[model samples]
Target: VPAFLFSGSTLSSYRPNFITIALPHYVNLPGRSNFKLMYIMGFPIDTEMEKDSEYSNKIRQESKISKTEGTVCYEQKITVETGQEKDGVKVYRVMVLEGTIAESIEHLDKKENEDILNNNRNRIVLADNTVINFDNISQLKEFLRRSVNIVDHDIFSSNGFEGFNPTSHFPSNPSSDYFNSTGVTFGSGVDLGQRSKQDLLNDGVPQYIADRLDGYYMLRGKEAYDKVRTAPLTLSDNEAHLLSNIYIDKFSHKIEGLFNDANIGLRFCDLPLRTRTALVSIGYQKGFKLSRTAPTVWNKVIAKDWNGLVNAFNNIVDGMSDRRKREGALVQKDIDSGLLK
Candidate 1:
């Protein structure tokens, strides 16, 4: 899973400043079997300025100044819940610095004035460099709103990642002499390349390829072989394997991919370094099961909605054993304690 450590901080430090509205939860639905939910927050930072001056020979100067005060704090609370029976729910509180840029500038101006009085009282001159602050709270809100939209949209549209779609196309119908025929189109842009029966018999074919052909032959009988002999060899075993594996790999890939992509890609913007490191720690804890050997059983288990699948997969991965599970639990504890941010 992508870590959301700095995400809360980033939202808090946004220009206009905002708070987390809700905590993360597993999005549940009756028929939708595979789904996960992600939560994020944002806020803004305050700015400051200082003044400097030196006294001239035998000369004294007077200083004039204007100043203002601004508000500078906000708080957010988030609630997190897990769908599983064994896991407990938790709530997190985040405190953020919130103020208008103008307010920060006022604070800076006051500091500069104090500096002039303490050390450079004789060298005071008109200071006119105005500090610029972020616009209104509305602008900050808009910025966060747009960022969230991009994150959501990009995750939804991406392919070759996970959970979007997984399927392959093959020639369902072919001429009696397809093996030697010139063109035979399947679904989408695929076309079977023409090859002679004599060529097929003479050249060695992969066992897997032969097995697929055997299946097709069973479906269409001896007539299918005759047709395949004449049809073009459009699809390769690798292509078919890619499609088949996607079905098996989709569930885990989507979960891991979405978590990593969103956390690292979208949530990293403008986050603090400390928080980013914590996110990395969380991400490592949320490991993925990418082993090819496990995909078939994993897919079946998920499809059947068996809770054992989660336990079994967690047991299989390194750093996620029983001891490590407790470590992950600790990480979340830290998050609730504001250590992750």
Candidate 2:
């Protein structure tokens, strides 16, 4: 049975919800207006001899049910005997009990002398013999109260969507929490002297680019660690070349989210790949949301002025010498190649 049959709130949204049952056993009772009632019924017990008779055994075989351990199961159809004539045809009344075979028998035995149509008690009998009826006005009121209580609780349920803070994960701030925790000030260019790859990472540079440009760390001893925390890094030609493709691939993924960020409103994908890469380099140096802190640099890109973009980005507030030189040179090359146009 569907929970909606007892759920009160479901009726509010659906108005008068219609359920169609396509099985043979489900049917409408005689006086109900198309309200389906499920029926299961069988013959009454006469004696143990008749109960386990050949006919009963045949029924058990056909229905794939056993009465061996005193378990009673009913057939899908029951035969009734009645004698009435209608214009030369013999008519028979088919009585259906809307419950289990056992409950049907119990109900039949209990209501044998009571006229159901004239019965003053308002009661409902379930298949498991659970009865629900109003004994007084307080019980009726309590039933109505609990029904709406469930409806109200369901309406107010958050469904696991509440209390999730979006800013914690994907913050729109110019500097990310990861950047702030690194203690690196802005414009400390990655390729500059005394700046490590970890500094590049702290400044929001892609890992692929920083890995090639920055050297590895070796903890020789406590004395060596005290002398120099790190040294300038170098990579082999093949290693640098192999890492170049990875850098481009990583930038491709990074720029997609950067382009869609609320602060950086421009679609970098619309620009040429070379120009897009140059812009992402500037973003790496400054931050993804250049428009948030440096509106002048973003305005140059907005105008598609490559020269203006380079100059504006290089002159950004507190711009580092090496960082500006690297990003400006790349943007200038793209401009000369007619890529930014």
Candidate 3:
């Protein structure tokens, strides 16, 4: 199971910035020609906060940004320039957002992913369908190495670790998106300064090799942003087990928050721990909606829509490619068919 935790100011301050910087590289930016082709990345600004909401009131009581403004969104058209700052990207847009955001697809703009190498870098998509989008030339290669190992090892479990833990940090892995979401790429040419040469070799890439890399990768999850920047770090199977527990705990909090935000009123509370955790893991990869055009099964998660939601979920499972059908099966079966409704 995957859960989230934060460092520095914890979730209060950390998640806000994490989403701001990370998503672009994997899902938001435009790619190059042989690249997934390309696009722009934008942030989800906290828009209208409920006057009496816990998160809203907490922000009011905490923080030092002294302004009556209760929202972080731009309700009016505003011009913002980004990407390759020297030449720059100029656009005028207004941002309207929900009061509370819990990893849903509606919040993001449909865009191609960014590159990891410089503007002219070449890339080869991974067996997992994700190209390394974050980190420097070295770290990007490291991500590819990591992805291959995870794919070969069944994503951390096959690494000889006891428990099941998916690798998605970088927040350190490849952002959750790299491991799960779109075919797009991000953090092209960005540097995180972390190297896993040993891990890279362990994956057996006797031959390897990315550009126009706009930069963005996720943070939060108590990520050791500097761990990569510092000396190398290695993990044994036992250590990976410990990390698995730690990440599950963090992701637990994130899942519960999503439940509340959607007014679903269903957390892991009614389900088995691993079952609930696995569901959130699926959501982490693809947003809760999990699709750009197709209707999301998430909308069916309410007391009245119970059967419909379950049916929608079953549909989601059936729609999976053979390779991905078993990805989140832990909870899907129960959700789709159950007793005593």
The model with the greatest lDDT is: 2
Ranking by lDDT: 2, 3, 1
Q: 1-341, model 3: which lDDT tens digit per residue?
A: 00111101101111222334444322211222111211124332211122333211111112221112111111111111111111122111112211122211112222222221223222222222222122233333332233221111233233121224222223334455433222111121112233233332343312221111111122223233433344333334354444343333444456556655665544334343323434444554444433332244455544435446445545664344331334334345444434113
lDDT of 3 at 33: 19
Q: Write the per-residue lDDT of candidate 1 for residues 1-341, one digit (tens) a residue.
A: 11122232221222321234354322221222211122333311111112221211111122111111111111111111111111222112112223233332333234323331222111101111121122332332332233221122222212311222222223343434533332332222122244332332334434444344322322232344445565534445354444333222333234344434544332332222222222222232343342243453234233432233333434545533553344334334433444333
Q: What's the lDDT for residue 200 in model 1?
A: 29
For model 1, give the 10-residue run with minimal summed lDDT. Answer: 77-86
How far does residue 65 in candidate 3 sit from its true spot (Å)? 48
User: Which scores greater on TM-score, model 1 or model 2?
Assistant: 2
Clashes of each: 22, 1, 33
| Model 1 deviation from the true structure expressed as Cα RMSD, one decimal place | 23.2
Q: Return the number of clashes found in candidate 2.
A: 1
Candidate 2 vs. true structure, TM-score: 0.29
The RMSD of every model to the true structure, in order and in angstroms, is: 23.2, 28.4, 22.9
Expressed as tens digits, the lDDT of each residue in 94-171 for candidate 2 is 222344333333332343322321222222222222223434323422332332211112111112111111111211
- Per-model TM-score versus the true fold: 0.17, 0.29, 0.30
